[PDB]
Amino acid sequence: ATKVVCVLKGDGPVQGIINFEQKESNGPVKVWGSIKGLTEGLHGFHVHEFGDNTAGCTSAGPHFNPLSRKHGGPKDEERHVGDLGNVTADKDGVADVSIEDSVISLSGDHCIIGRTLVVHEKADDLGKGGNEESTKTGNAGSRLACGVIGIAQ
Amino acid sequence: ATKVVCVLKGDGPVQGIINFEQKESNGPVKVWGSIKGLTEGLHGFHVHEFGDNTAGCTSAGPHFNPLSRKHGGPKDEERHVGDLGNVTADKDGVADVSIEDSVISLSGDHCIIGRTLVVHEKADDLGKGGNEESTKTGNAGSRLACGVIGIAQ
Ligand SMILES: *[Se]c1ccccc1C(=O)NCc1ccc(OC)nc1
Ligand SMILES: *[Se]c1ccccc1C(=O)NCc1ccc(OC)nc1
Ligand SMILES: [Cl-]
Ligand SMILES: [Cl-]
Ligand SMILES: [Zn+2]
Ligand SMILES: [Zn+2]
């Protein structure tokens, strides 16, 4: 019933299209699409707090964390709202994204519209990296590509 | 105070940053910033319905029109919510934007977050051009640059 979309681009050759769909406000969000230009393996994938791309992906700020929790993976109770885990690129450098999440929303209070979706340099350790940063950023490194999450038809 | 921002980009030289700020719920929104790479003169300036930039500015769809009105200028009663009139570029090709509008909002059903801001090829005739298209698009022609309207810090 609600559809939103995000075009990912950045400083390098990473580019992607990510769709979000939510049947009812009380419902899970299905996330699908594709990103190309990636190194093979896991890349952290997060909604960041601001939909501000003024100075590139840096202006998006920290992970979207309306409930003031620590960083985790999407299956954890202890996570930021924006913690969508990792996407995986194949040897061709393509990640086919297929996620269902019940914490992000396209309505309500945990709404991600107007925020920024970011795909990161490195794997998100999902809060299990063994250092302080693990519970803040997941050590996923720099921001390869991003875009503002917008209302679709 | 709610703050939102939009980075305008497109296929050619047109690029801009536009800020929006709203001090009170249902109060006027101040719009300010700058766009460069334009031809001297008026360029239509609108909030379009979808924050969908998957295929560039075309995917943004028609003017944002939650109240099913006809096209007009920002100072008309009969206008779309997204009708912000024209920005004016000087001989250097620079438009310095300074608008206050009391129809758009940064909350509620008039909210423009997650929609697309578009700067157009030609002047918006503000619905006074004396053809049919005047009361739909204002005859402002192609979409030179656009961006999704995102939440700012
Ligand atoms: Se996103 C959000 C947060 C808090 C309250 C309400 C909303 C909301 O979803 N309303 C705005 C909206 C979003 C998407 C669409 O597209 C069909 N229309 C309106
Ligand atoms: Se206003 C609007 C339109 C479409 C979707 C969601 C919203 C919304 O109200 N989102 C929450 C929001 C808006 C602005 C700020 O500024 C700090 N925070 C949250
Ligand atoms: Cl980060
Ligand atoms: Cl148009
Ligand atoms: Zn996080
Ligand atoms: Zn209009």
**Exposed/middle/buried for B25, CB within 10 Å: 0-12, 13-18, 19+?**
exposed
Task: Tokens for B106, please give them.
Answer: 């940064």
Ligand 2 mutation target, pool B107, B112, B115, most atoms within 8 A of CB: B107
Three-state DSSP class for residue B83: strand
Place of tokens 């009812």: A24
Listed as own residue / partner, the contacts of A66-69 with beta carbons closer than 8 Å and 24 or more positions apart are A66/A109, A66/A110
A94 contact B CB<8A: no
| Ligand 1 mutation pick, A2, A64, A115, max ligand atoms within 8 A of CB | A2
B38-42 contacts at long range (C-beta below 8 A, 24 or more positions apart):
B38/B14, B38/B87, B38/B89, B38/B93, B38/B94, B38/B95, B38/B119, B38/B144, B39/B89, B39/B93, B40/B89, B40/B90, B40/B91, B40/B93, B41/B88, B41/B89, B41/B123, B42/B86, B42/B87, B42/B88, B42/B122, B42/B123, B42/B124
For chain B, the residue count is 153
Say which experimental method was used. X-ray
Taking contacts as CB-CB distances below 8 angstroms, the residues of chain B near A152 are 50-52
Residue B39 gets which letter from DSSP? Answer: P
DSSP letter at B110?
G
Is the distance from CB of A54 to CB of B33 less than 8 angstroms? Answer: no
List of residues 6+ apart from B77 with CB closer than 8 A? none
Four-CA torsion B6, B96, B78, B48, nearest 10 degrees: -20
A83 is in an annotated binding site: yes
Kindly determine whether residue B115 and residue A150, on different chains, have CB atoms separated by under 8 Å. yes
Cβ proximity of B2 and B152 under 8 Å: no
Instruction: Tell me how crowded residue A71 is: count the other CB atoms within 10 A of its CB.
Output: 27
Q: Which residues of B touch A114 (CB under 8 A)?
A: 4, 51, 113-114, 148-151
Helix, strand or coil for residue B57? helix
C-alpha to C-alpha distance for A141 and A145, rounded to whole angstroms: 12
Amino acid at A116: T
Distance of alpha carbon A97 from alpha carbon A63, whole angstroms: 19
Residue B38, domain CATH? 2.60.40.200
Overall number of domains in chain B:
1
Please give the resolution of this entry in Å, rounded to 1 decimal. Answer: 1.5
Q: Does A31 touch chain B (CB under 8 A)?
A: no
Measure CB to CB from residue B148 to each of A50, A61, A150 and give the nearest one: A150
Which 3 state secondary structure label does DSSP give A77? coil
Amino acid at B96: D
- On whether any CB of chain B is under 8 Å from the CB of A153, the answer is yes
Question: Which residues span the domain enclosing A45?
Answer: 1-153
DSSP helix/strand/coil, B43: strand
Query: Which pairing describes strands B2-8 and B143-148: parallel, antiparallel, or unpaired?
Result: unpaired
Degrees to nearest 5, angle at CA A60 with A45 and A91: 30
